[PDB]
Design a protein around this ligand. Sequence first.
Ligand code: A1IX9
Ligand code: A1IX9
Lengths: 251, 265
Amino acid sequence: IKMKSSDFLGKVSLAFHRTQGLMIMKTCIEHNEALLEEAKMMNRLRHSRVVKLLGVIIEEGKYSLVMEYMEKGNLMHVLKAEMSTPLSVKGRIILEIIEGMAYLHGKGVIHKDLKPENILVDNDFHIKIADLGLASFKMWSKLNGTLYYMAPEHLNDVNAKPTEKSDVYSFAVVLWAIFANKEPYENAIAEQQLIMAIKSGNRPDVDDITEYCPREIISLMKLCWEANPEARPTFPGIEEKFRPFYLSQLE
Amino acid sequence: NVIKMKSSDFLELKVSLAFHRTQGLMIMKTVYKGPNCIEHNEALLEEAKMMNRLRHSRVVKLLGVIIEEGKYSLVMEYMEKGNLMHVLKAEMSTPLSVKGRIILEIIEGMAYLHGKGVIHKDLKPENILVDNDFHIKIADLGLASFKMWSKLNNENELGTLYYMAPEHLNDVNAKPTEKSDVYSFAVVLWAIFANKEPYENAIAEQQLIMAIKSGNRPDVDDITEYCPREIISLMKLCWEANPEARPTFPGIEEKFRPFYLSQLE
Ligand SMILES: C[C@H](NC(=O)C1(F)CCN(C(=O)c2cc(-c3cnn(C)c3)ccc2F)CC1)c1c(F)cccc1Cl
Ligand SMILES: C[C@H](NC(=O)C1(F)CCN(C(=O)c2cc(-c3cnn(C)c3)ccc2F)CC1)c1c(F)cccc1Cl
């Protein structure tokens, strides 16, 4: 959907569409063809757990992407709020993340940058996975803490290709963060030390989860952050074990 | 993945209930009982491997195949409450909130199948199976999508048109599309709120077929229970005579999900 600036009244702003209401907007003639098709690739990913690109503004000197407004922000923001989020809601968040990831991998899409900033939350505490850094979109990205969720095989090795297992690693650390209510690795001394430590087997401190976290989720996070990518499960594999666990115990 | 299971791993509803020695209770459809055809065994296996790729919480799983000498069977997961019509006709009544959730799950199931380039061809309440928590799974029990296994059935010792889009009635070279499945869905929605099959007052099959082809639909006034205005609009839109005028399942999901969340959940 090719939108115009005049339908509303870089940087992120909250915007009011004249016919369609409240959205979030992030703001060279040769690149316009490629940018449009690249946005058409973003729009083909349609699922309840995946954010929707509602459209794009290609004007002279303004290039913007417009997505749906997710009222409660990112996942870390919800987790760090004073109103605590009960075990049943955390479990459902996990299930929904699994569903969103299973959908993306089923379409041959590797996220590459799964992290709590990229898990957006609506007013009823439902989630959608997003690619807010534009990891999957070269031209739009070109036209424009961060490493805690990254699989060790990508740390100090920028040339190796991401796989589905890269996202499984990220998921693992998201699970830890969901129960810890914070970023991991608070007691690290420096980033290069940390990176090397992580590459050698260091992982978030399981004992730093104070609240009740069921044994199954702790087992799951450990399996999903295994050093060998081939030892990590797939998202279909995770869904089939986690769904019945969620239904019996958490729902 | 698919398990090549053996008869000896198991200890009529031909559909039988079967107990696997290490894996418990399943349902078996024994497709062929007769003289040995070793040639088709490769094709039957791979065809079952291919349909085993359709994996989603809202579609049933093929757990295994039995490819033996003169015995060809398919094994699926057991769904404790049977089909949707059986749930709906039961005495212990099903609240609006559970019905709404059922509709959402059917939409999710169908959106997944369509997203894989599968057209069901025979969506109906007998193909909508129900677990003990009232969650649903779509199935293809008559083998509409399994060509070789369907061929094998009609070699050997061993449907309803109420859900069929009007364009396939009296059209023996019928070419189903995704919009054919959307029509079926529409009548499923009606049946979920009526608690019964439509067209009770139809007398003959030719009368009904011609009536439906001329624009007759399930009787909206014959829903006695509360059905929200929105769902009535949705069933009407989904059973539109022109297939191009029916929405897709993703289109349905986007309008139905937030309605479900605000009003029905
Ligand atoms: C299908 C899903 N699609 C997308 O994620 C988007 F289309 C990516 C592009 N988008 C924005 O750039 C965007 C960002 C912002 C924004 C707000 N705050 N900040 C810091 C940034 C605001 C408005 C915006 F339009 C929109 C969402 C997808 C995918 F395509 C590929 C892989 C995984 C996934 Cl999950
Ligand atoms: C992914 C899903 N897969 C399937 O639906 C099945 F693999 C179909 C094959 N199956 C049986 O034939 C079967 C039937 C019966 C049976 C019970 N009652 N009756 C009257 C019959 C019992 C045991 C059985 F194994 C198993 C389930 C699918 C698909 F492949 C294609 C299109 C849509 C869909 Cl949804």
